[PDB]
């Protein structure tokens, strides 16, 4: 019975309360099919430095459908939980270094597999096994409709001031990316003061004119812009990256997880998930 760790990240992972009886509300997809939901335990209010009260919740979305497909293909059972600290995972200095987020849970044995929109990168690949990518995407910039920014090389990003605020999500692949590239140090120092605990909080802050630009995954940002017409993406993709399933290096499932993902791209299953969860709406 595999312990699966995930994270709230629409449209990949939706997280909703259970009904009073502890079951999940019956719903249908955009195509009329029943939505497959799983019980996922996790903390409720994610306020930093506070105690975490774990409660059963309902999880569904692209990554949950992918998990169900992996479980049926490879004949394994599982139990899903939401990452306790609500983060994707970075390695921070404490000489000693430690991993937080889903990366920390997988390496400590709190999870056996990460099934989420987890970016494949050098830093994490030294410690864990990533599958071949289940999604190819990159980074883009989300702004309020009307905000004029050319992209990553715009002077309001490259020569920053407190008049135009931009940020990413703390302890994420975007935070890793900006901290590693010396040429991005000017931007990293600006963002460090303004980074958000979660993508949802950052997206809301762009809608509320509290954050002028949010730098994040195009797979998420393009979805948000397709749903909220006051939100737009700007500029070409940069840091073209993919999402992969994460496992420990000694996992007996690693070869078959990657073969299953390749099979899914090739037979149209991955495109079926894009049509169900990602590309069905337009602004």
């Amino acid at each position: 019975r595999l312990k699966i760790v995930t994270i709230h990240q629409e449209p990949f992972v939706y997280v909703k309360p259970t009904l009073s009886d502890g079951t999940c509300k019956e719903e249908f997809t955009v195509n009329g099919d029943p939505v497959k939901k799983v019980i996922c335990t996790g903390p409720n209010d994610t306020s930093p430095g506070s105690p975490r009260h774990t409660v059963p919740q309902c999880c569904y979305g692209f990554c949950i459908d992918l998990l169900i497909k992996l479980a049926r293909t490879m004949n394994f059972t599982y139990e899903v939980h939401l990452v306790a600290d609500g983060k994707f995972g970075t390695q921070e200095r404490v000489n000693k270094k430690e991993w937080n987020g889903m990366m920390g849970e997988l390496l400590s044995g709190q999870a056996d597999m990460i099934v989420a929109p987890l970016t494949i990168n050098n830093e994490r690949a030294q410690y864990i096994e990533f599958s071949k990518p289940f999604k190819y995407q990159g980074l883009t910039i989300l702004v309020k409709k009307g905000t004029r920014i050319t992209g990553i090389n715009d002077p309001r990003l490259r020569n920053p001031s407190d008049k135009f605020i931009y940020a990413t999500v703390k302890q994420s692949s975007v935070d890793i990316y900006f901290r590693r590239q010396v040429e991005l140090s000017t931007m990293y120092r600006h963002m460090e003061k303004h980074n958000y605990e979660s993508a949802a909080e950052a997206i809301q802050a762009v809608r509320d004119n509290k954050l002028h630009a949010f730098i994040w995954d195009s797979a998420v940002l393009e979805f948000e812009a397709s749903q909220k017409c006051d939100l737009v993406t700007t500029g070409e993709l940069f840091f073209r990256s993919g999402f992969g399933i994460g496992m420990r290096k000694d996992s007996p499932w690693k070869q078959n997880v990657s073969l299953s993902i390749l099979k899914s791209h090739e037979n149209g299953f991955m495109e079926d998930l894009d049509k169900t969860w990602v590309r069905y709406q337009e602004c």
Binding site: I120, A125, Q181, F239, R240, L262, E266, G268, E271
Partner: protein
């Protein structure tokens, strides 16, 4: 430390030139050339190789710390399983003639059963090239799926024996059997067929098609959709199963992506005027 590496010409990933040494952005690469067809005798002609994948190989050689003897495959091309035996670059790796295969080598499920692939280093998949304005939705378009429902039927093909034909054969049996009369011997023949009106569409590797549309004279030939890709995958370095080289090659490729070294290679080799 000194590794036998196999490649295959496919511009701009691997471009072959005549040699009396290899200079500039080129590396030595040999090609076995037959003396005649009534002998097994041949000679290893010294040639020079360059391109996106050659630049990747140079970076890996330096970072991972290996030297190599690069050769061009002569038994087939990228890789096909024929009577259960792999030929092409895949075959060279399977049958341990090469430690690794570097080139425009698509990662797919059946190849991953016999070789280990590195992380993908170029995004690809299956795209469709048409003359600008051709109305085709994607691979699921009825003009492709049920071709004889149209009078006259749509004329489309691929270059057989690669990952694209294998995908079409497995997914769309009627389309596949219809298409084989439009098989193109190579990408250059297919582009000529499209430009002279002998073909309506050409289905092939997305990365090569995007590169060709980028350089098309007059920018007449385009890939359908927003440069739409079915069965998104990538090119990968093929290694022997259980290779001790995979771990460090993967970390190095991921380091290059993370340091923006891949975007530079894309600008240098792939982006076109169109």
């Amino acid at each position: 430390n000194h590794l036998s590496i196999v490649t295959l010409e496919e511009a701009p990933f691997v471009i072959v030139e005549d040699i009396e040494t290899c200079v500039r952005n080129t590396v030595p690469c040999r090609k076995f050339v037959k003396i005649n067809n009534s002998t097994n005798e041949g000679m290893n002609v010294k040639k020079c190789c360059k391109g996106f994948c050659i630049d990747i190989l140079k970076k890996l050689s330096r970072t991972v710390k290996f030297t190599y003897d690069l050769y061009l495959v002569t038994n087939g091309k990228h890789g096909k399983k024929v009577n259960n035996v792999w030929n092409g670059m895949i075959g060279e790796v399977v049958y341990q003639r090469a430690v690794m295969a570097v080139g425009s080598l698509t990662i797919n499920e059946e190849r991953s059963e016999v070789v280990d692939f590195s992380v993908p280093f170029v995004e690809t998949g299956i795209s469709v090239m048409v003359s600008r304005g051709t109305q085709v939705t994607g691979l699921s378009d009825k003009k492709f799926q049920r071709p004889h429902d149209y009078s006259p039927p749509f004329r489309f093909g691929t270059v057989p024996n690669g990952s694209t034909e294998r995908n079409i054969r497995n997914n769309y049996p009627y389309m596949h059997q219809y298409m084989t009369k439009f098989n193109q011997k190579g990408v250059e023949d297919a582009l000529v067929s499209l430009k002279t009106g002998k073909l309506d569409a050409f289905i092939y590797d997305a990365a090569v098609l995007n590169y060709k549309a980028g350089r098309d004279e007059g920018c007449k030939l385009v890939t359908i959709g927003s440069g739409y890709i079915f069965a998104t995958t990538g090119y990968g370095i093929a290694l022997q199963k259980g290779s001790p080289w995979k771990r460090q090659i993967d970390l190095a490729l991921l380091q290059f992506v993370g340091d923006g070294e891949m975007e530079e290679l894309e600008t240098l080799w792939l982006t076109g005027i169109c």
